[PDB]
């Protein structure tokens with residue numbers, strides 16, 4: 001039953017659906033060249049069902065992903081990008097963060113990565129209400145008002161990328177400076 005795995009009151013189709021991704025040091029300027037997948041093993045998540053490009057509504061929540069990854073001792077940080085999907089995208093809010101119950105209640109092949117299947121013409125079509133693509137959605141983290149957007153890997157390519165902020169210039173001061181940034185919410189969510 002689709003109904004008990006997807007929250008319909010938090011799904012919608014949208015013109016130019018933007019979300020933010022956190023980019024590590026190095027990798028800022030090539031990600032503004034664009035999204036396409038990593039060859040170095042991870043590609044999104046440990047479990048196959050869930051590999052895809054991960055983004056969020058909240059740029060602040062995005063910003064703390066722009067840090068470290070073999071050495072937190074250099075206080076650097078890359079920046080945040082606003083990635084944006086051209087035109088018409090659905091966002092299917094899952095009410096269940098668990099893949100075989102997601103594949104079974106939605107009636108999806110019981111033995112694929114679910115993010116492989118979100119990719120198909122048959123999923124875009126069947127669930128996208130006329131959308132060029134579907135992005136899944138589960139919240140951010142416990143008790144947080146932000147959602148997390150799991151983008152399919154192929155449908156993700158066709159995203160475009162602008163710099164939201166870039167801590168990669170402050171080398172040693174990047175991570176410190178980032179706190180200041182994340183301190184704008186309590187001061188600018190208003």
Ligand SMILES: Nc1ncnc2c1ncn2[C@@H]1O[C@H](CO)[C@@H](OP(=O)(O)OC[C@H]2O[C@@H](n3ccc(=O)[nH]c3=O)[C@H](O)[C@@H]2OP(=O)(O)O)[C@H]1O
Nearest residue numbers: 021022023027030031034035036042044045046054055065
């Ligand atoms: N041009 C590029 N195109 C595509 N991706 C690129 C590109 N260049 C660099 N990447 C990186 O490749 C991974 C793709 O998601 C991310 O790095 P990470 O350090 O593994 O990022 C670490 C983790 O943070 C997650 N994550 C990152 C940012 C964010 O906003 N939210 C989030 O959940 C990733 O899902 C990843 O999860 P897993 O470690 O569980 O794989 C990303 O920064």
